[PDB]
Amino acid sequence: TIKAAKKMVEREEAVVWDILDEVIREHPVLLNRAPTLHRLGIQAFEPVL
Amino acid sequence: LDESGIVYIGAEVTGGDILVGKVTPKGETQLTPEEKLLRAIFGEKASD
Amino acid sequence: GLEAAFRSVFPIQSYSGNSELQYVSYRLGEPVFDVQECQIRGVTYSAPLRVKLRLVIYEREAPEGTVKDIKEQEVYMGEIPLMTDNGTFVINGTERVIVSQLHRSPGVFFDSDKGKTHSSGKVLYNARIIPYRGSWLDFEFDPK
Amino acid sequence: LPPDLRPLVPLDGGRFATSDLNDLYRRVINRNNRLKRLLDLAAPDIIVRNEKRMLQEAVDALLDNGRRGRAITGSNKRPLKSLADMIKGKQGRFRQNL
Amino acid sequence: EKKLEAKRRKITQGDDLAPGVLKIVKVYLAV
Amino acid sequence: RRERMGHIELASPTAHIWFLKSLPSRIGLLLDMPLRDIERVLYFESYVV
Amino acid sequence: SLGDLDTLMPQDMINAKPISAAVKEFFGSSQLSQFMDQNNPLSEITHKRRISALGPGGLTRERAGFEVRDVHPTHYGRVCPIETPEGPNIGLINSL
Amino acid sequence: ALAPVGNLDSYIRAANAWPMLSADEERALAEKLHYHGDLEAAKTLILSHLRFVVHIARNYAGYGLPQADLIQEGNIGLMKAVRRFNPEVGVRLVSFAVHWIKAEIHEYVLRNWRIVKVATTKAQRKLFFNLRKTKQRLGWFNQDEVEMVARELGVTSKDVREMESRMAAQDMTFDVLYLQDKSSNFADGIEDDNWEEQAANRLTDAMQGLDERSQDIIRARWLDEDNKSTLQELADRYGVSAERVRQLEKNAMKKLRAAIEA
DNA sequence: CCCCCTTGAAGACGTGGTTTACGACCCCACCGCAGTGAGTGG
DSSP states (O other), X not given: OHHHHHHHHHHTXXXXXXXXXXXXXTOOEEEEXXXXXXXXXXXXXXXXX | OOTTSBOOTTOOOOXXXXXXXXXXXXXXXXXXXXXXXXXXXXXXXXXX | OXXXXXHHHOXXXXXXXSEEEXXXXXXXXXXXXXXXXXXXXXXXXXXXEXXXXXXXXXXXXXXXXXXXXXXXXXEEEEEEEOBOTTSOEEETTEEEEEOEEOOOOSEEEEEEEOSSSTTTTOOEEEEEEEOSSSOOEEEEOOOO | OOGGGSOEEEOTTSOEEEOHHHHHHHHHHHHHHHHHHHHHTTOOHHXXXXXXXXXXXXXXXXXXXXXXXXXXXXXXXXXXXOHXXXXXXXXXXXXXXX | OHHHHHHHXXXXXXXXXXXXXXXXXXXXXXX | OOSOOOOOOOSSOOOOSXXXXXXXXXXXXXXXXXXXXHHHHHTTSSOOO | OOOOOSOOXXXXXXXXXXXXXXXXXXXXXXXXXXXXXXXXXXXXXXXXXXXXXXXXXXXXXXXXXXXXXXXXXXXXXXXOSSOSOSSTTTTTEEEO | OOOOOSSHHHHHHHHHHSOOOOHHHHHHHHHHHHHHOOHHHHHHHXXXXXHHHHHHHGGGGGGOOXXXXXXXXXXXXXXXXXXXXXXXXXXXXXXXHHHHHHHHHHHHHHHHSSSSOSOOSHHHHHHHHHHHHHOOSSSOOOHHHHHHHHHHHTOOHHHHHHHHHHXXXXXXXXXXXXXXXXXXXXXXXXXXXXXXXXXHHHHHHHHHHSOHHHHHHHXXXXXXXXXXXXXXXXXXXXXXXXXXXXXXXXXXHHHHHHHHHO
């Protein structure tokens, strides 16, 4: 169930970290700093935990 | 909690812990027949 | 202080001129709670204001008679928040600070406008009278 | 306007949070009802004229408060926010939400 | 004894709560 | 309740302030009348033939 | 003016609520009334010695020119020329 | 009465410009109004007393309501007194109409002082106009002061405290935990829907293990929504005792629980 | 350990008789900018 996964995530078991390491692989994120004056104020990066 | 429902002085607490216990009247509620039958099977009573 | 306001409002005469109120003096009572007690209980640390007021009855049966009766009684006006020894006020159990203000003083100031009628290329002089309480009087020049 | 776009939510200590549109609508409804009552009571023309003028002022305040004369103010001495103020300015619908 | 009784009067005096409020509990946490 | 509108029946007609006070005035331009005279007539200060 | 009885006490003349309400409003809602900055003793002393040009009867942040914000020769010994906020209130808040 | 009224100030001038009649000619209009139904007599009486309403409404400026609205409320009350005036009594209309004019203003203040009506019942209305004068010091009444107020006005202690809270309430404007919609968290609803669906499937699987007779016992009494079959109705359909139907559910439910808990 | 009773009563759901209680109605003798408008004088 969703509730069991919620409890597992909240308790932060060791398998959750491996699952997160698999999730973030090749999943870019956008970084933005205000004020955005030109388009180079938003860029994509590959996250490292 | 102590006998008055208030946490002891000096206790170490984290997120989600109860500090002061309190209850409220709830009134009428609606439940689906399946969940009501499950509650009856498990034997737990209904509270006000 | 409070004396200035008291003598700026009192005495008060009625419309028909048959009775008036006269202010005598005032005093401040002892605060109910201490500063620490006020902070613990979350209440304002203030003192009560008690004024002596005198009532005058005017005798309308005599053209110059105003000695029908006189009554004297001490009356309560409210609570004045007090200042601690460190220059702070305790309002609802929390310490607050009143910041001083820097403003233009009352009087008359003579000014010369600039950057206006620059096509004409001349300067216009104006004057203002600013009171502590009232309306503003101004004098000014047009190009002619 | 639909009620959910002008919310009225109760609070704990007997207080309420409300939009100014409710007050403007209440003023308009009150003056309209008073005008109808006066018209059904066979009133002199001057009082009906005054009521019509106040109804016009209330409608103008509801549609756009600060446009002709003194803006109708509330408890905090601040002018009431009208329908036109909702969709214009830096805090209007467009720039703030769209 | 008079001063002690005055202090105890001041200590045990009740609170001034708003209407419809029964009691209030305050908890302080340090970290 | 987010979609349903109501209506109020007015005992007497009232003018729309947008079509009156937003310069240039549409009512005044259409009637070829000065805005001040229209304002005087609307707020019950003079008559119009 | 409206009253009739001559057996009128001064307590019948005075209603104390408006004055208390005005004083409470001043001490709890004025722009110059604010919570004490209690980060450290220096912060408290700086707060107690602060001079502001805003508030009732004062200027406005949006309607302030360069002339009122600049250091004046008469400030020598009266207003600190280097202690002021770095934001839009740069020239309107000073220290004694 | 064709004077122009461009604002409230211009309306007061016309009301004051009307000459105040004397008692002698007031009787003639009132007599014609009462017996012959002269609409002109009422017209003259109402217009000549318009200044009477204006100075009365000035006394009600502490409530924060517009002055123009208060004046018009009094005007309706003035018309009611005119329609019910008996000239043969000998008293002036000014003294008779003072009760009607102040009754209309009072009712308008009650309904419009706040966004919600504060006083509706009989006891609340009495406390609305008395607590303003009775209250002398800011704050809440103590326990003792409640009975003193309640004893004079003939009200209970509950009413005094309830109206005390309603007087000091200050309404905030909408622009803090009150802007949040409390039924907007869809993620919680999805989780709760998933949890209730997987529990229902366990009930269906458990019911399959029951015998055919026991399944219809649980289904009819507990699962049906149109009807709730009692113990006696199931007895005649299967030729069993009234207690037998009741006693059968206990054993069946234990089997249902055993399958579910496993 | 299936079956039909018993036999005593606990609560179960109205229920509109009976009875308060709410709500309403009646009487009361800065900042520079640009478009507008009269307003002349001609």
